[PDB]
């Protein structure tokens, strides 16, 4: 059984796009992003705990962290479920990417359905930046765009 989900990303910063999720049974989640309007280079890319946009991207809460770990890189053992690292924006301010991840299921108790994916202004230091925010947020700066992960037909 395939579950499908899609986030339409908006923001006050003119960055836009979609992120498409799929998961067959209880295997990995495939996530395919198409982003525009971003500063060239690395941008923090997170699943946040909430899909509350009452105060734009600021109300989506902290990083999704059911395991109660510190902030890290996707490859790390010591990471949040929602830590999908950096996406690289081209010189035209677009990004197109597929990542596969094992901690962002689309069903069961840790489902990210109805949570928000968030693109950040700045790189995610992956917990290694030695800044006060490194080990909590990765010090990725402003939530320039976010989208609620909605069930797809």
**Minimal distance in Å, beta carbon 72 to Zn ion?**
7
Token code pair at residue 133: 């925010």
Instruction: Tell me how far apart the alpha carbons of residues 76 and 25 are, in angstroms, rounded to a whole number.
Output: 24
Q: Is 130 in the site for its own copies (CB under 8 A)?
A: no
Q: Are 37 and 44 in contact (CB under 8 A)?
A: no
Q: Are 30 and 100 in contact (CB under 8 A)?
A: yes
36-65 footprint of Zn ion as x/- string (CB under 5 A): ---------------------------x--
Task: Exactly one of 63, 79, 115, 125 is catalytic; name it.
Answer: 63
Q: Is 71 in the site for Zn ion (CB under 5 A)?
A: yes
Q: Which residue is nearest to Cu ion (CB)?
A: 46
**56 backbone dihedrals φ, ψ, rounded to 5°:** 50, -145
Taking phi over 0 as left and psi of -120 to 50 as alpha, with beta for the rest, 21 belongs to beta
**2 backbone dihedrals φ, ψ, rounded to 5°:** -85, 125
**Minimal distance in Å, beta carbon 75 to its own copies?**
11
Instruction: Tell me how far apart the alpha carbons of residues 25 and 9 are, in angstroms, rounded to a whole number.
Output: 26
Residue with tokens 């010090």: 139
> Does the annotation flag 147 for ligand binding?
no
Task: Exactly one of 80, 115, 124, 125 is catalytic; name it.
Answer: 80
Among Cu ion, Zn ion, its own copies, none, the one that 130 touches (CB under a kind-dependent 5 to 8 A) is none
Judged by the rule CB under 8 A, the positions of this chain that interact with its own copies are 1-6, 8, 18, 20, 22, 24-28, 30, 32, 49-54, 59, 61-62, 65-68, 70, 88, 97-100, 109, 111, 113-116, 132-133, 135-137, 148-153
């Amino acid at each position: 059984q395939m579950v499908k989900a899609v986030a339409v990303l908006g923001g006050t910063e003119g960055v836009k796009g979609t992120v498409s999720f799929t998961q067959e049974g209880d295997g990995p989640t495939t996530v395919s992003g198409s982003l525009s309007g971003l500063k060239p280079g690395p941008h923090g890319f997170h699943v946040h705990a909430l899909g509350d946009t009452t105060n734009g991207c600021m109300s989506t809460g902290p990083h999704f962290n059911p395991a109660g770990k510190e902030h890290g890189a996707p490859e790390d053992d010591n990471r949040h479920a929602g830590d999908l690292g950096n996406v690289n924006v081209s010189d035209d301010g677009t990004a197109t990417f597929t990542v596969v991840d094992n901690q962002i299921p689309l069903s069961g108790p840790n489902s990210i359905i109805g949570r928000a994916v968030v693109v950040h202004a700045d790189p995610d230091d992956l917990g290694k930046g030695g800044h006060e925010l490194s080990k909590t947020t990765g010090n990725a700066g402003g939530r320039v765009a976010c989208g609620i992960i909605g069930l797809q037909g």
